[PDB]
């Protein structure tokens, strides 16, 4: 079989991969910005009195506590599921890679070129 086909296939697959990388990165940037905008409510520089300032400030304090509790909870969930993912990674690696671990070597490199020693 010609390896030129594999080279062309790898060029096309590399183009696919880079396009999908940039596309997903851009989409994630847009979604992130949109979510932050619709969730991080902007602060207003005018239109509220000092009493209104205090009222809205305490309202935002309560909201900050609520969503901080929520995000800490989901962060803890991420941590636990990440521990689980690591454990399962070790499990499946022992399932598969327990045979391949010793295979990692760079062999017969220098000693094969030592015929002039004697």
């Amino acid at each position: 079989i010609s390896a030129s086909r594999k080279l062309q296939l790898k060029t096309l697959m590399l183009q696919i991969a880079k396009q999908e990388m940039e596309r997903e990165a851009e989409e994630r940037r847009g979604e992130k910005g949109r979510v932050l905008r619709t969730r991080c409510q902007p602060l207003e520089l005018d239109g509220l009195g000092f009493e209104e300032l205090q009222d809205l400030c305490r309202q935002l304090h309560a909201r900050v506590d609520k969503v901080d509790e929520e995000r800490y909870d989901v962060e803890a969930k991420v941590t636990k599921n990440i521990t689980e993912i690591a454990d399962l990674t070790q499990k499946i690696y022992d399932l598969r890679g327990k045979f391949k671990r010793p295979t990692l070597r760079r062999v017969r490199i220098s000693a094969d070129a030592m015929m002039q020693a004697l």
Partner: protein, 371 residues
């Protein structure tokens, strides 16, 4: 940087950089002072030839191994051997390279502590780690279980391992090895007229043992055959002529491994200490150990040993279990290949005994967590 995988051994020092297939420099570990007077002036005669240089001038030297049975009995000579190994056979200063020595199981503590103290004070390495000679031989086979019989030249030890968990209560260390076989061969050669006495002629007897001896599949039948026919008598040319003919001394020298009563040792052969080492293990991992028996070390290179040992164990073991004996062709350097693999691992990179740790706890750090 790269790590230095040294392997002191007893009889051949094997060293080389981590990550290769074979040791870079392999040379006998003997240090021989000259014994005669010396009349030529200015010949440039040194006071001690070490390594492979003393195997060429052995006619006028008194070679003496610095390692008797695993343990080191002459620390100055061992320091000289290490200095030679680092500077002339590898030509890499030790100030810029981690080292990974190897040590037999059940050895005296003082030996290991002195070894680490030398490596940290005299040669001044960045970090050194000491590993048991059998776990490496298990690495090289690419297994993770199995009971490995590492019959070196100094000491034969038999470490069983399961799923990576070594069983410290089942290690059976026996002090019969290649050197005792050399002495016994030198002692039975006298039955034909050939007398080797000098410490230099021990090397000639060792060469005879390596090139001619083999392990008999069945001892009595071979003894009967060699006593009637003459199809076994193989001849060998000494370093000066006068060929010699070895008769039934061929398979009687390595038979001592399976009957240590020949050299007066009480214990049982290497065929029965493996079965005893297995039977000390738990009842549920005996099948795996039976199926993954590993051979290593130099002395297990006799032609026909992987069949004799299998026959013996099959005789001892229950009839249902399958007995398999792993005998890779690269047996001699199996320990060093395993050492290279272990030193090349990323997970192992934080187990070295760093120098600052030694400065804080003294040489007794080796027995601590950094094993």
């Amino acid at each position: 940087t790269t790590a230095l995988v040294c392997d002191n051994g007893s009889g051949l020092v094997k060293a080389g950089f981590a990550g290769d297939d074979a040791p870079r420099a392999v040379f006998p570990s003997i240090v021989g002072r000259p014994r005669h007077q010396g009349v030529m002036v200015g010949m440039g005669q040194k006071d001690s030839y070490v390594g492979d240089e003393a195997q060429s001038k052995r006619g006028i030297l008194t070679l003496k191994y610095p390692i008797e049975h695993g343990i080191i009995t002459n620390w100055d000579d061992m320091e000289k051997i290490w200095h030679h190994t680092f500077y002339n056979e590898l030509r890499v200063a030790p100030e810029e390279h981690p080292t990974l020595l190897t040590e037999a199981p059940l050895n005296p503590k003082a030996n290991r502590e002195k070894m680490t103290q030398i490596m940290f004070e005299t040669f001044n390495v960045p970090a050194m780690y000491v590993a048991i000679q059998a776990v490496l031989s298990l690495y090289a086979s690419g297994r993770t279980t199995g009971i490995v019989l590492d019959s070196g030249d100094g000491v034969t030890h038999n470490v069983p391992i399961y799923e990576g968990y070594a069983l410290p209560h089942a290690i059976m260390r026996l002090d019969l090895a290649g050197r005792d076989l050399t002495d016994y061969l030198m002692k039975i050669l006298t039955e034909r007229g050939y007398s080797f006495v000098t410490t230099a002629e021990r090397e000639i007897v060792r060469d005879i043992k390596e090139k001619l001896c083999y392990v008999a599949l069945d001892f009595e039948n071979e003894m009967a055959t060699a006593a009637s026919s003459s199809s076994l008598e193989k001849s060998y040319e000494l370093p000066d002529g006068q060929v010699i003919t070895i008769g039934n001394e061929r398979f009687r020298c390595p038979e001592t491994l399976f009957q240590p009563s020949f050299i007066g040792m009480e214990s049982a052969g290497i065929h029965e200490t493996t079965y005893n080492s297995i039977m000390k293990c738990d009842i549920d991992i005996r099948k795996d150990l039976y199926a993954n028996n590993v051979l290593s070390g130099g002395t297990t290179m006799y032609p026909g040993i992987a069949d004799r040992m299998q026959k013996e164990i099959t005789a001892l073991a229950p009839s249902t279990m399958k007995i398999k004996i792993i005998a890779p062709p690269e047996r001699k350097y199996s320990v060093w290949i395993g050492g290279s693999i272990l030193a090349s691992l990323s997970t192992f990179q934080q187990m070295w005994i760093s120098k600052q740790e030694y400065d804080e706890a003294g040489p007794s750090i080796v027995h601590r967590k950094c094993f």
